[PDB]
Symmetry: none
Subunit: 453 residues, 4 copies
Amino acid sequence: TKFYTDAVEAVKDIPNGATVLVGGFGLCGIPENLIGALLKTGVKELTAVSNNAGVDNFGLGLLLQSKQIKRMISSYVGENAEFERQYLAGELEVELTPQGTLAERIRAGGAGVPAFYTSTGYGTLVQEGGSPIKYIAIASKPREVREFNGQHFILEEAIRGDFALVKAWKADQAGNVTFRKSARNFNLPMCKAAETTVVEVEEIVDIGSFAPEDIHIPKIYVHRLVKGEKYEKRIERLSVRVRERIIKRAALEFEDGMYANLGIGIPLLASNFISPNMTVHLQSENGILGLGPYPLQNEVDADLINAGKETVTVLPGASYFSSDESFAMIRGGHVNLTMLGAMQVSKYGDLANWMIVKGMGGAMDLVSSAKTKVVVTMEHSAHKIMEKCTLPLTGKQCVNRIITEKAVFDVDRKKGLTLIELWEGLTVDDIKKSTGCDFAVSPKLIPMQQVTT
Amino acid sequence: TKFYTDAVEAVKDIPNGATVLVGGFGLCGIPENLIGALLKTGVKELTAVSNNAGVDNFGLGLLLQSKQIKRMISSYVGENAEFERQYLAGELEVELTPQGTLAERIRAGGAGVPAFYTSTGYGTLVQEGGSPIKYNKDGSIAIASKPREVREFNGQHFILEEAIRGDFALVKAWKADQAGNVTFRKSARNFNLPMCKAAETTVVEVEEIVDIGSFAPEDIHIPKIYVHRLVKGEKYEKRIERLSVRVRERIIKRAALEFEDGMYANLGIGIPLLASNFISPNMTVHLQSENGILGLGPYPLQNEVDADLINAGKETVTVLPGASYFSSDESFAMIRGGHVNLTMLGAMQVSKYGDLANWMIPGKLVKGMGGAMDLVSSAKTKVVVTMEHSAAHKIMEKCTLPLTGKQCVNRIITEKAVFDVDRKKGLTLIELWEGLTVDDIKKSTGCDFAVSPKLIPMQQVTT
Amino acid sequence: TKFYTDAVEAVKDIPNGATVLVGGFGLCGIPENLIGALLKTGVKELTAVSNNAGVDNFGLGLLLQSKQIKRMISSYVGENAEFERQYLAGELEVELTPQGTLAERIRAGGAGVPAFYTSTGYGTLVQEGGSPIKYNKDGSIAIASKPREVREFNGQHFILEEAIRGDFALVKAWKADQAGNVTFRKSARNFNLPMCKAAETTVVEVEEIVDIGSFAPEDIHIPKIYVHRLVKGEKYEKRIERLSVRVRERIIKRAALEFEDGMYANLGIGIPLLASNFISPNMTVHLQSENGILGLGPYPLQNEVDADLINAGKETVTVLPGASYFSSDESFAMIRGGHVNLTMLGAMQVSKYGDLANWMIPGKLVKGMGGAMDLVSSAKTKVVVTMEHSAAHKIMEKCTLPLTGKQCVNRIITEKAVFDVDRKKGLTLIELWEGLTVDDIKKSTGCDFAVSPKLIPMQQVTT
Amino acid sequence: TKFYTDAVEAVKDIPNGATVLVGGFGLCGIPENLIGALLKTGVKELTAVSNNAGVDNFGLGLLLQSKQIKRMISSYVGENAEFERQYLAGELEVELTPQGTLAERIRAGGAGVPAFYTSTGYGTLVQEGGSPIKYIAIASKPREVREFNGQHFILEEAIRGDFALVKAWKADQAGNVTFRKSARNFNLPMCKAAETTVVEVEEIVDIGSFAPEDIHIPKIYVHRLVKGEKYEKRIERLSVRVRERIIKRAALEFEDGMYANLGIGIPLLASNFISPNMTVHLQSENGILGLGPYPLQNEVDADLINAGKETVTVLPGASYFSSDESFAMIRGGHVNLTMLGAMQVSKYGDLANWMIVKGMGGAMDLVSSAKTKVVVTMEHSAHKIMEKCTLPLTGKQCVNRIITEKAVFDVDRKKGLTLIELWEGLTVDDIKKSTGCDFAVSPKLIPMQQVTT
Ligand SMILES: [Hg+2]
Ligand SMILES: [Hg+2]
Ligand SMILES: [Hg+2]
Ligand SMILES: [Hg+2]
Ligand SMILES: [Hg+2]
Ligand SMILES: [Hg+2]
Ligand SMILES: [Hg+2]
Ligand SMILES: [Hg+2]
Ligand SMILES: [K+]
Ligand SMILES: [K+]
Ligand SMILES: [K+]
Ligand SMILES: [K+]
């Protein structure tokens, strides 16, 4: 590991057109000094592999503002207007990649795996191809489909970069590195997938400061190391400590000892109604197990945010891990319940909830496992529940239950919808008229429940 | 995470014929109490996914001794006589799987990846099929492994390997907090960590249970989500397999010059490891141990001996300041990815274009390839072979023993010569021992070779 | 084989929304009686797999006029105004499919092949998706074609195409014996033969029914096993679309020198075909017609005019002694396989490295690629482009119009110059018109180019 | 087309190690003069792509005898002892390839198709790989599997040769060529799959002798043409015009207007009991539709043989076509009934009937379609009907009915076996004891029928 005192010297040889991996989730764990150095060198036509686009004037945004990026390989690109502008204008190329797929492709890129199969994106424009990468001048190409154990998977190829720009917490004098809280995300796997990895840290410590069992990134993967000069500790979303109907029914999906992942909005609100006698472990795809409530203004930590990029806290016994690890945890079905909002759901369980053009985030990986119960919360109606979806799919035959303010439906990939709960006041015919496809009625149809909390 | 006070209660429902993942590298990090429990329940016909076979009367060996295993999916199975006996007798089925492939298939089994491509095993019986899973009393092969599909990426060949998932995982860990979070001690981690994510029911036995909060959240090795059943092991024998306390010399002394300051190297047992003793103290060399260590140090003083710290040869060792420990999948991701600069090992035969044969002899050596096939699997890693020159030619046109890798050896160091190997142009003699002439080498080698225009006497380290 | 005396009874059970394969090339070999029957039954929302759209009031046109078609899977759809109208209006759906790909997908649909790889369409909207299937009244594209998977073999790119199977096949044939064996006359064969094997229910209409035994068994074009329903057509109009009876001249006269004795060539409409008129009678050139003819002769005298014999441009033609006729799949197997030595055609733009753009203009030319994409799909076939030099540059760095093929043009002949094209080194000027200098060409061309050290004046055939 | 008067001049430039396509089915339509010329030139280390191995001293046999072949790509190699000897001895390499796959791979080789999918061999050692190609020193590699429309197919690659040695009937002076009766087989597609095709014919005729609609191989595919000097018109099998129980029940599988393909032995015998008031069209995979009975000694024609290589005749209205065409006809399910003998059949319909090492012939293609009813005839028992087969599979879940001398079972891929007919004298328990897996009993169980003819 070579130590540098100046950031620019550390990245001065990145070439025009190079593929650069840039760590960070939102504004959490971004290599702000190395990004600042790239502004100075002026290197351009970069293919930036980065989970998000930062914001308008920070993180990758600064580099979009300077016209230094030709293409981005990202999973979520919202909250960046200049980004959206260049993209919808044919000025910038963008490969929207499922978040889990992105993380796994990077890990494969450093693990000697040229390609692997994943369920994520099967049945959507990721597999099918055809999304614009550039204005159309370039479209995404399809992904091969192959079946295993009676299920469809698509082939994804490893992503390797010429350089990796990584933000980390500490480095000992030998080049060993660790990451703080949720600032880890993509920084860790990105560290092993480029020919030259450049790491910027907040502090350099003595060799011996780390228990050897606890080194997040061993020195072997750290080629260049610099102590970042300035850390703005920017926080994107400061969050300090009919719809109610959906929320109160979604609250009953929780079961003691359950591992759940809650999407932004109604599902996360639901968690506020969890009985304190019930223990629910909330997973955050950016790498956290054990989300707690929003912080008191003074507990606010820029290294701890949820997937919605909001400042949060964690409960006792929580853990942090990398983005590849997080989606291995999700893809592998270890999370018991995935609950999220949705635009349309199909009679057999297709979900449409990421495009009408910010990207799918981790949505496609969250509904990719059959071992994980997927529950959708959404306002009932224009029909949002039909025969076939009309909006781009997030997954196929992947939703198990729908909760609207009118009804609760269990979803089955073959037999369709079954109404199991009905709101007091409505009759089966009201639901019929408000739904765009037939459905069975449970012989045990009850009034829609509401949590008592 | 459900806590149990009795091991038997924790594994009593494993069914006959179940596929059980058993952690451990050698006798390091084995779940000896859960293994003891399986002796009690008597469950049988098990497909045991275990890196090694333990030893004759410990670890998986106890379960081979009780006839509780039908098949093993392992990478190295030496040092277990009863094991060998059942195998050569058609009593036990065995899938010799490259160590890195084993680790990666298990991780895939927990990561939702049904299959992936790896270089490891390309061009050998792993890809070709023909590896013996079950022998006839002595009529050769009764069940042979099936071939692996081949496909090319970026001008290189890779083979398709499928995920391995178990019904149960028997994992040894160091500590668990009251919430079920788990950590591993030193090199005892190895396969315990990925196995923890690849079975429907993971059962973890630990040496100590601590308060929630005893772990910094950043440093939990296995989050509670992967831990379904937890028990505090009742007895820990802390057994040590190999107690190692602190012509050939020619090879050793020339191999010593392969080291370069700041180099990451992986040294196989024997000559390559001895070479490391001649490293100048003014040179910093980082030694990687495939069982999950970066920074091997010298052998321990008898009182520094730790059962949780062993090298890939299963010998007690130490680590240098700044060392790290990580899991088996992580270790082979590091090796398959080419992050290690130099792989140095012994070999039985090497081919004119670089094929290596160093893990199986007809029906005389059948302990498995270990991590050898992964170590020579990357083009980004320089592979150097150390071996006595002849026998009978060990350097020929084509190998005759099962290959470890194809066109993967870059240099050969014998006590007579040093050859650089090129996948297309063949061998080039670059060093020659004082006293021999090019013709002596010619006569001792089984295929033509160029002679460097800068042919020097064979160097020897001065240390 | 069931015989019917009435066409309507033979197709009365076709269901609304059915996928129906309709044979014919232009107005050659169309099942006009079965089409007439479909008018009577009124069946609708049909997906019509038909090479062409017939003309305004004949062939598939009658069925577009009656609104009986929802979608068409065709390769060339020009000369049908009502067709164009429904299409540009969002009334009719259309999958423009390369002709050779259409033929091959149909054959696969009857041969038990669900999918195969072909070169045709690689690098264009066929592979990329983006081809318009359905237009908005005028808001561009309402439904765009989906991309085709790409995969490499032997260092070349190919795309995956799936079989096409129909519920019904409406086939025009020449004769049927009493057993149901069928034959086709001259070039009227085209798609009728493979379509006969790709539908659950094939319905064949013939001009004559003959005794069993009238065919030598070696010469039955479609064996009775593929013929489920047979009817003798009641009326045959024998309609002829194009009656053809027996600066630019510069291009023509230089293109004439591309012919070499014993050469197999395919000449596109216009300049390339005219060039063939200057072939020395001492030279034997075999002209291939993608609609299934080998050995085209000159245009017929008015009384030699035969509705069953037309060239790919749909013009009445003749054949020379020793000619052969074969099906559309066979024809494109011959072309995709590179058996034709020279493909010569007109073009709108060609790129520095050989990309060709010659089948679509923004939203001004949308009749389809015909067999153009298959003709330039093989590396074994020399592709020569004939075109006026400028417009506005027709030879640039990159094309701006939809591509027909990538790096597939080998030579360009304009009235000013002749350039040989190389996929890597670009353009090389090899011939120059008397009067112009290298700088004149430079100024008229949109990208650099080498100059042959053997640059000659542009040749002209003496005939 | 270049005409030669001497065979040797026509093949003198074939190089050592070249891949040569050699036409012929058995001894029918073999290029005996060109093969004789190869003996003279002595060219060696050839990869011979040939459907069969000829016999011991004729056809490809002559070239195996001279040690001029290094490898063969064939579908059936029986009736050639020297062949078997070199193979079992590690002297000769052999890729056993399903006949239909062979024909299609050759056609793809001339049609610009590098690869395609076929059902044939799915679930057997063709897909799985591992068969010895050479002694083990070389094993067959697996074939990729991919699903389409809910069915599995394997990927097969095109076969192209450096040269094709083709036997044909006539050539006009322009190089157009035709084939006689069943002597066509592989000669026709082989003609389009090599860089240099050499054709030997029995007669050269005037241009104009062929109707242009009837040219089997257009001149474009014929690069070199020679009139063969000597034609021995050799006939391999001269066939001139408990078990009876199976035969008499198999005879009832025929239905008027049916297209059937009958394997050697019991199925073909069954055809002798076809009522003359019923019209049954028999397909022969070597390229014939309309097989008739065995010929009178004087009707014997070496160009007309059945798949069993026996001299036969054809009925009025018969047709001849090429090997690729024949298997397109079979793979595509146009044949209604495939009836054959078998060693073992599985509870769910797996068939094992080609290896215990002569090759699978067309067997794997005949049971490859779901549109074709597959009926197996075999002696009942050691159990030949079990849970799983123990011998190499011909197809998976592909047998629909089994006829033994004891019982008749209908086979279903999911529910298993159902006894529908029972021989007079036996009881359900007799069958139970003679069968290696459970089975349902039809509620309409009848005594086993017997044709009355
Ligand atoms: Hg399956
Ligand atoms: Hg509605
Ligand atoms: Hg290779
Ligand atoms: Hg020797
Ligand atoms: Hg390319
Ligand atoms: Hg210009
Ligand atoms: Hg499916
Ligand atoms: Hg039995
Ligand atoms: K699910
Ligand atoms: K290497
Ligand atoms: K070309
Ligand atoms: K069937």
